[PDB]
Amino acid sequence: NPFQFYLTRVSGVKPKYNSGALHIKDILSPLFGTLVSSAQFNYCFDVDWLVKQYPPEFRKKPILLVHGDKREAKAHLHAQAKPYENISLCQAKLDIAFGTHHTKMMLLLYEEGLRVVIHTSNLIHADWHQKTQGIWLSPLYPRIADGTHKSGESPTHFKANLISYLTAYNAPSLKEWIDVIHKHDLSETNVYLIGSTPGRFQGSQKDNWGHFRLKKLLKDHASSMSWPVVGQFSSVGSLGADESKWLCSEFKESMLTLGVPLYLIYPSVENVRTSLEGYPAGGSLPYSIQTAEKQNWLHSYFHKWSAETSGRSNAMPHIKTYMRPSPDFSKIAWFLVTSANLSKAAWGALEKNGTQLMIRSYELGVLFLPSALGLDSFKVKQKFTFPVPYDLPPELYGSKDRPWIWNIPYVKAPDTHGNMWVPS
Ligand SMILES: NC[C@@H](O)c1ccc(O)cc1
Numbered sequence: 001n002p003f004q005f006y007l008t009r010v011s012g013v014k015p016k017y018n019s020g021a022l023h024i025k026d027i028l029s030p031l032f033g034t035l036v037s038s039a040q041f042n043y044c045f046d047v048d049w050l051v052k053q054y055p056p057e058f059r060k061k062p063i064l065l066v067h068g069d070k071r072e073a074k075a076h077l078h079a080q081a082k083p084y085e086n087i088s089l090c091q092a093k094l095d096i097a098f099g100t101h102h103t104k105m106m107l108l109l110y111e112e113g114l115r116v117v118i119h120t121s122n123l124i125h126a127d128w129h130q131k132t133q134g135i136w137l138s139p140l141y142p143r144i145a146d147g148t149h150k151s152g153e154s155p156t157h158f159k160a161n162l163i164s165y166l167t168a169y170n171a172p173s174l175k176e177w178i179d180v181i182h183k184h185d186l187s188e189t190n191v192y193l194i195g196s197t198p199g200r201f202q203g204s205q206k207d208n209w210g211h212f213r214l215k216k217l218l219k220d221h222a223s224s225m226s227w228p229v230v231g232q233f234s235s236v237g238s239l240g241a242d243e244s245k246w247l248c249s250e251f252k253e254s255m256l257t258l259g260v261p262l263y264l265i266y267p268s269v270e271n272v273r274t275s276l277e278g279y280p281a282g283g284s285l286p287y288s289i290q291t292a293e294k295q296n297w298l299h300s301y302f303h304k305w306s307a308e309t310s311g312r313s314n315a316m317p318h319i320k321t322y323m324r325p326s327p328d329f330s331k332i333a334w335f336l337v338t339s340a341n342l343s344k345a346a347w348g349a350l351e352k353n354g355t356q357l358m359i360r361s362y363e364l365g366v367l368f369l370p371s372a373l374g375l376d377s378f379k380v381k382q383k384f385t386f387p388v389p390y391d392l393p394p395e396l397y398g399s400k401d402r403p404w405i406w407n408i409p410y411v412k413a414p415d416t417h418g419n420m421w422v423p424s
Helices: 022-029 047-051 069-082 158-167 172-182 201-209 208-223 248-257 269-273 277-286 289-293 296-301
Strands: 007-008 036-042 063-067 087-091 105-110 113-118 134-139 193-196 200-202 228-231 262-265 319-326 333-336 350-353 356-359 363-369
Touching: 022 047, 022 069, 047 063, 047 069, 047 201, 063 069, 063 172, 069 087, 087 172, 113 363, 158 172, 158 289, 200 201, 201 208, 208 248, 208 356, 208 363, 228 248, 248 262, 248 319, 262 269, 262 296, 269 277
Parallel strands: 036 063, 063 087, 228 262
Antiparallel strands: 007 134, 036 105, 105 113, 113 134, 193 363, 200 356, 228 319, 319 333, 333 363, 350 356
16 A cells, blocks of 8 residues: 555445544554654644543653644633643744644654654544544664764655654754654655645745645656646635636646646535534534635636445545546546645745745645656555545536635525534
8 A cells, every 4th residue: 555545434424434544543553563752743632632632651741732822812822732741842933914824744763663644633532533634654763873874865755855844843842853753764655745835935845845846746746648637635725806817827837736626625504504504514624605705706616526436425524635636537647635725825926026925824735746656646545556435527617606715604404414504
């Protein structure tokens, strides 16, 4: 299994649909290594819940929480953590407004080596219960024989890329994790790291982050051959007055690079209503009427959530993925799993006559390139060759479908649990 790409367990589907699926408890289990220390980067945290996901024997090992909370929210987080002597926090600077620290990553230091986990789930019960979420598991990275001279680097430059990502936080607690990574052999890594970090980037620095980083990797590491682009996400930023402002111009341009139809997959009201969760799934799909009414054009790009291949049609997506399938959808030129949703905040927007990339948020993903495996393309695994976790080709919204919008009421039809949705 070259990909090490997994979905989270979904409770309440047939056990067959959970066979190759992982819950956080499985990720933190002793079968994965003898835990010594860990860092949990994320957006939302339930500390009590989180600590319980660790095996009892490991529950007292040091844990660093890397978050972006401020003021009263920071207060609350610290409050959640206080009861736990072994937990420290690192507040990631968010110097630009409307930025979030959105990256989901685990750094797991064991007696036997180091593991890196890049995934899409918040550290709260509901994100791991009945949602479709994605996980990439690094291999167990051995410690470098403390008597040998080696970089421990991979052909994909993952090790240096991860260190640069951590370096940008400028945070004392992360330097220690940077030192740990220095000491390990990450050479077996076959994926590319794609990060976002807050900033306004000029010249050479453009290629380091966001969609320009992706564009750069696709230039150097794919090659060419009406192959569509597919984008799949749970949050939608303000994209501009029309497609030419950002979506089809700079964003899609990065995405189509190699060496054009755009399918966007976003849950409809109907997908949410009949989900395992019902309407409360919409709490994790925060598309506001405010934003949506500014850009009604975007919605003709939208396709339904359907995941029969993985049995998760009813498990609302909090995973985010982007990919480049062939015209018949039987193959792909690459696959990206990331925390980045469909927003300029996450991906970057060009400022000052296209000479500046402005990014608002921390985001992190892994890119699977056939070349890193010595292939030209991946065959799509038809029934959850790359494991595409949702159905192809994507299915267009019906005429009566609407995109889920979180902050309006739905009272005409009850959801899966006989409830309505009246936000307020
Ligand atoms: N339910 C919390 C809400 O703020 C939220 C919504 C979507 C996310 O990805 C993360 C958090």
